[PDB]
């Protein structure tokens, strides 16, 4: 026939063949389903875009054209869902959300 990538077949972008190998060497089970490498791989696309779209948003708010960890730091930590997700993740060079305590504000 004609070679057609599974990612194309799912209409996805992430390399499922890579992971099905990786799942295969990942020793998570001695056998592995076929749609599982697929099933995860799309959701993989979801979160990256989800973060990437946020990464784009903050990137615009300082009027830059290229995304940086500070943007990444800001985006996820500005997202309560992502921040709850990545609470045990610390970001390299990401910095901190600017936030001064109310009582430190001068009378």
């Amino acid at each position: 026939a004609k070679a057609k990538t599974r990612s194309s077949r799912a209409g996805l972008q992430f390399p499922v063949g890579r992971v099905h190998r990786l799942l295969r060497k990942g020793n998570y089970a001695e056998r592995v389903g076929a749609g599982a490498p697929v099933y995860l791989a799309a959701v993989l696309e979801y979160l990256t875009a989800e973060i990437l779209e946020l990464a784009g948003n903050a990137a615009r708010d300082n009027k830059k054209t290229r995304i940086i960890p500070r943007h990444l730091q800001l985006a996820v930590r500005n997202d309560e869902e992502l921040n709850k997700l990545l609470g045990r993740v610390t970001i390299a060079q990401g910095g901190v959300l600017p936030n001064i305590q109310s009582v430190l504000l001068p009378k």
Partner: protein, 93 residues
């Protein structure tokens, strides 16, 4: 030496969301860093459940439930759809 990573696919998705935005390399490494993590956390979680029910093969039933276990709230809700849509698309295709 050869090193395989995820930059190109991430680069493709970015141009899906922001077709004009650029990107650094360090942040790309972060993305590579991040993907592998969630890659790992799901899979072992996926593994041990199959252990909990004493099964030997991991399918989407396994994958989806842990995604519900791993992703909180709306992401889990929305991403399951993202998983659900692709799977049927693959089986149909």
């Amino acid at each position: 030496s050869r090193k395989e990573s995820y930059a190109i696919y991430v680069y493709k998705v970015l141009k899906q969301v922001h077709p004009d935005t650029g990107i650094s390399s360090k942040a790309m490494s972060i993305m590579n860093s991040f993907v592998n993590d969630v890659f790992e956390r799901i899979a072992g979680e996926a593994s041990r459940l199959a252990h909990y029910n004493k099964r030997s093969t991991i399918t989407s039933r396994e994958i989806q439930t842990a995604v519900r276990l791993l992703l909180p709230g709306e992401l889990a809700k929305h991403a399951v759809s993202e998983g659900t849509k692709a799977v049927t698309k693959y089986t149909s295709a």
